[model samples]
Target: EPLRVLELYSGVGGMHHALRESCIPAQVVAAIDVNTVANEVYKYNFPHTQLLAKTIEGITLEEFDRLSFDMILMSPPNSFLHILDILPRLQKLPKYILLENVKGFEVSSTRDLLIQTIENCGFQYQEFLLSPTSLGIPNSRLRYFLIAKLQSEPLPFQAPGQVLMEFPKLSVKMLKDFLEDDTDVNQYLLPPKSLLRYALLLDIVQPTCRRSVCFTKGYGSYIEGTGSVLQTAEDVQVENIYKSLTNLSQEEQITKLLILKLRYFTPKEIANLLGFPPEFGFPEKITVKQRYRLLGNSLNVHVVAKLIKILYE
Candidate 1:
C-alpha cells in the first residue's frame, strides 16, 4: 500500500528529501516544525505540501484526526528526549515508521521503555548506529535510527549499542570533486595565521582523504570539535613548516604556524559531503552561520535514504 507520511519535527525536510531520494511510493501529506525559518525553507522547496510551523503537541485533536497517514518520518530536536512518551497517548499512529536521533539514543532508558512498549502497540522494532562515513560518504556523523514496523510477531532488541559502529561502504565520489570552486568559497577560508596554534585542534583532511569529522552547528564559528579543516595538496609546504616548528617551544610553534593560512569547508561543500543534492539549499537571505547550524541539524541523506528503502521498498 502507498504510504501517507506525516513528517514531525521536519527540520528543512531532511526526512522529506530522504523519502524522495529513497524513491519510495509515499506522499508527504504534511510536514510540521516549530522553527519559522525551517518551515519557510521547507515550504519553499515543497510548496505543495501543507507546512505547519507549530509544535506537534499543539496540533488540535480534530486537525490530527482529520488526516490519515500510514507512516511517520521524524528527527525530533533535543528538547523532546522522550520520543515515545506521547506515542502511547496517541489514539492512532502509523503502523510503520522510522525515527532518527543522535548516536547515544541506544543507551537511553527511554529507548528501552519504547521498545518494550512497541510490541504492545502492534509494532516490531530494531535500532542501529549509523553514519555517512560508514555508508561511504566522506563525512562522519554517527546517528541513532529506529525502525518500527507493524507486525504480528514481536522483534528482538537489536540495538548496536555503540556510537562508533560501522556500515558497509558505498561507492561514493571523491571529496575533491564534491568541493565547490575556490572562487566561490575563498571568503570562508580561515583568517591568516588564525590556525597557527589551533592546527592540531582541527580534524584535518586532505583532498585525497576519505574522511572528515562530523560537522556541527558550530562549524566555522567555533574551533574545537566543530568540523574538519582541509590541508589541500597545494598547501604541502605547511608540512615542512610544521616539521621546523616541532623542535621549537610551544610558543615558537604557534608563532610559525600563525604565518600559514588555513580554511574551513564551505557551506555548499558541507551539503555535498552530507549527500544533499544540488537543489537542496536555504534561501540566500539566510545568514552563513544559520546555514551551518541548519546543516548541523540535518541527517546524512545517504544513510537515511537507504534506511527508507528498507521501510518502503
Candidate 2:
C-alpha cells in the first residue's frame, strides 16, 4: 500500500503536483480547502481523489484524528492563525510532516508557539528559508518551509532555531530557458508606450539575463516593484533603474529612459519559471487574472519537490 497522506489547506493542489512531479509513492488520501473555485480545479485535475471544500477550522479534530494517513503535507495561510488553531489538537500524530509558507514566518510569536507545539508532540523539526533562484531558476521568491519527523524515542525538547543551509550559487537562468519560443505573443505584450509612461526602475529585464524580479498578483496593473517586464534581446540596453531613477522624481524618471521593445511575460511563461509542469493548467472557465493570481499564490514546484525528498530519505 502507498503511504497515505493528508493535505491541509491545499490550494489548487500545489502540494499535490509537487509530490506527483517528484514521483513520491505517497497518496494524497484527502485535500482540504475553503475556496470553491480552487476546490473545483483540484477536483478537475485529480478526479478520483477526495477534496473537502471547508476551512481547517470548520473540520472537527475528532474527525481529522480518525483518519489514518501516515503523513501530512500542508501549506498553511501566512496569517499564522491555522498553526495555533489546528496543529495542537491532532489526535493521531503523523509520522512525517512538511509545511511551506512565506518568509518572515520564522520571526513571529507564532513561530515560538509552533516550535513549542512540535516539541511537545515529540517531533524533531527543521526550518528552511529557500528561494527558487537557489535552484537555478531565475525567478526570486524567497519562502519559509518547515519539516518535522516523529522520533523513535522522543528527544528532550528544545527551541527550534534557524539551521544554516547553504544554497549553491547557481548560474542565472536566461529568459529563454523557460520562455515559450517565437509565437504570436502580441496579445500578451503590453503597450510599450503605456508601460513606459508608468514603468519605474526594477520593473524590467533582458531575455539573456539569468535573473527576474518576483512576479506578484499586481504584475500588469502596477509598474514599480511588482514584477519584471521583458525586453527584446537585441535592444535590451539596461540600467539598475532602481538607482538611476533616483536623480529624478517618479514622473520625471519615466520620461528620462527610452522604452525599448518590451512586454510582460505571459502567464504560461511565469508558471513555467515557477516550476509548474507544462501538463498542469487551469480549466477553461478560469480567467486570465485568476490564472495570474493563482500562479502568484502557488509554489515553485521544483523547490517543493526537492524539499519533500528530505522526508523519505
Candidate 3:
C-alpha cells in the first residue's frame, strides 16, 4: 500500500526534506505548523500541499479521518506538552512514526506518560532515543528519536503508574571523557599556558572541575570548543547560547592569539562539521549567524534518509 503521511511541526521542512532524501514511496497528505516564517519557506519549496498554519491541537481526528495514513512524522518542539491528545484520534492507527526532540526526554515524566499511553492503548510501540551523532549523524549533537508502531499481535503493556523497572530505556550519553582518557583534550584547544593549566586540573591527583558538561547550542559554539583542546566549563557545552564562555572580541578571526584563543565558528566550518559536502550550496545573501542558526536547528538529513529506508524499499 502507498504510505500516507501527516507531518507536524514541519519547521523549514527538515523532516519533510529528509523523507524525500530517503526516497521512500511516501506522500505527505498534510503538514501543520504555526511559524509563519517557516511556513513561507515550506510553501515556497513544496507548492503541492499547502502547509497549514494551524496549531496541531486545532486538528481533530474527525478532520484527518478521511485520510488513512501509514505513518505520522513529527519533529515537535522539545516542549510539545500537548501530544497526548492526538495519539487517540487516529481512525486506523499508523504503523510507524518518528519523534525528534532534545535529549533527556527518554527519562522525563512525559516519556513515562507516552509509554503509559502506548501500552494502555494496546499498541506495540518500540522507541529508541538513538543519537544521530553517534549512530546516525556524526559529531554534530545529540537528539532523541521516538518510534512507535501499531502492532499486529498482542503486545507488551506496561502498567500505568506502575513504573516498571525499565520502561523507556535511558538514552545513551557521552562527554569529553569519552574522547580521551580524563579528557584533557581541552588543553590542546586552549592557549599553551591555559592548556597546561587545564591539563593539570584534570590530572591524576585532584579533579576540581566538578560538574557535568553542558551541551553546545550549535555548530558556532561547537567549532569554538573544537579550536583548542579546551574542555568546556564543568558540564557546559561549547555553544554560546548560554554565554558558556566569556563575551569575546567582536568578529572572530584566525589570529595567532585566536589560533590560540579559540572562538566562534564561521560559516564554511559549520557546514563541514554537520557533514554537509564541501560543495554544498551556500546562500550568498545570508550572514554567518543566520546560517549558524539554520544548521543548528536542522535535522541531519543523512539520518532521516536512513530511517526512511528502513520503513520503505
Candidate 4:
C-alpha cells in the first residue's frame, strides 16, 4: 500500500514534485499553506490533492488524526512552537518526517527543540547541509535538511551526528543545458538606469559557465545578491566593458553595458535550475514578480527527491 503523506508550508508544491520524482508510491493526503497565490499554483498543478489555505496552528489534532498520514514533507517558514505543539498531540505520529530550510537552521535553538522532541517521540534522525551544486545543477542553493524515521525503522545509511556537506559523487553541467531555447527574454533585460547604477556589482554568468549564485525572492527587483544575471552576449568580455567604465560618461557606460545583453533568468529558466520540471507552471494570471517570489521561497525538487529516496530506502 502507498503511504499517505501530508505536506506543510508546501509552497508551489516543490515537495510534491520531489515526492513524485522520487517515484515513491505515496499519496499526498493534503497540503497546507497560507499564501493564496501559491495555493492557486499548487491547485493548478495538483487538481486532486486537497490544498488548504490555513495556518499550521489552525488545524486541530482531530483534523490531523483523521488523515492518518504515514509521512510528512515540509519546508516551513518556521513556527517551531506550533510544530512542537502539534507533534506530540497527534494520536499517531507519522512514520517518516523530512524538512527543508535555509542554511543556519541546524544551529538554531528551534532546531534543538525539534531534535529533542522527535528523540523523545522515538525517532532516529539525520541532518544535512546540502546544495544543488553538489548534484551538478550549477546553482548554489545551500539548505538544511533533516530526515527522521521511527526508532524501529532505522535509516539505511549510518552517518550520524554530523551534517554532511558533500554527496557520495558529483558531476558538473553547464548553465546553458538548463537554459530555455529561443525564448524572448527581452522583458527580463536590465533597464539602462539599473545597468548604469548596479552593473558593476551584479554577479554575471555566461551560459557556458558552471556556476550561479543562489536566487532569492528579491531576484527581479533587487540586483545584487538576489541572483546571478545571464550575459547573453557571451562574445563580449564583461571584464573589458567594466574596465572602461571608469573613464566613460554615464551615457557611454550604459551603451557599453547594454552590449552584454544582461537579463534576469525567466521564471521557467529559474524553475529549471531549481529542478522543477518543464510541466510545472503557474496560473496565467500570476505575474513574473509573483513567480520569482514563489520560486524563491521554494526548495529544489531534485535535491529533495534524492533525500526522500535515502530516507525511504
Clashes of each: 0, 1, 13, 0
Candidate 3, superposed: residue stretches over 4 Å from native = 78-82, 133-138, 153-255, 258-288, 311-313
Superior candidate under TM-score, 2 versus 4: 4
TM-scores of the models, in the given order?
Answer: 0.87, 0.84, 0.60, 0.96
Ranking by TM-score: 4, 1, 2, 3
lDDT of 2 by residue, 58-126 (tens): 676676766667788888764246544656677667778888887788887877788788778788877
Once superposed on the true structure, which residue ranges of model 1 sit more than 4 Å away at CA? Answer: 78-92, 153-172, 233-237, 246-261
lDDT of each: 0.74, 0.73, 0.52, 0.89
- Model 4: which residue pairs collide? none
lDDT of 1 by residue, 1-313 (tens): 6688889899878888888888988888888888887777788778898888877876765566566777878887633433355556566777777889886778878777766777668886667788786666888788998887887654433333333254322675567877877534457667545566466666766677787889999998888888888664364566686678667876677666554445678877888888888887778788888888888898888888887776553
Model 2 local distance difference test score: 0.73
Q: Pick the candidate with the highest lDDT.
A: 4
The stretch of ten residues in a row with the least summed lDDT in candidate 4 is 151-160
State the lDDT of candidate 3 residue by residue for 1-313, as single tens digits: 5688888888656677767777777888888898776666567567797577987777666766766777878876632545566567767767767777667777788877777876666655444444345442224455666655566553244232332222221232332222323323343343444333333232110122212222243433333332222333344333432242244432321122333333233334333444444344344555445555555665655556565664443
* Sort order, lDDT high to low: 4, 1, 2, 3
Candidate with maximal TM-score: 4
TM-score, structure 1 vs. true: 0.87
Better of 3 and 4 by TM-score: 4
Estimate the Cα RMSD of every predicted model relative to the unseen true structure: 3.4, 4.3, 10.1, 1.4
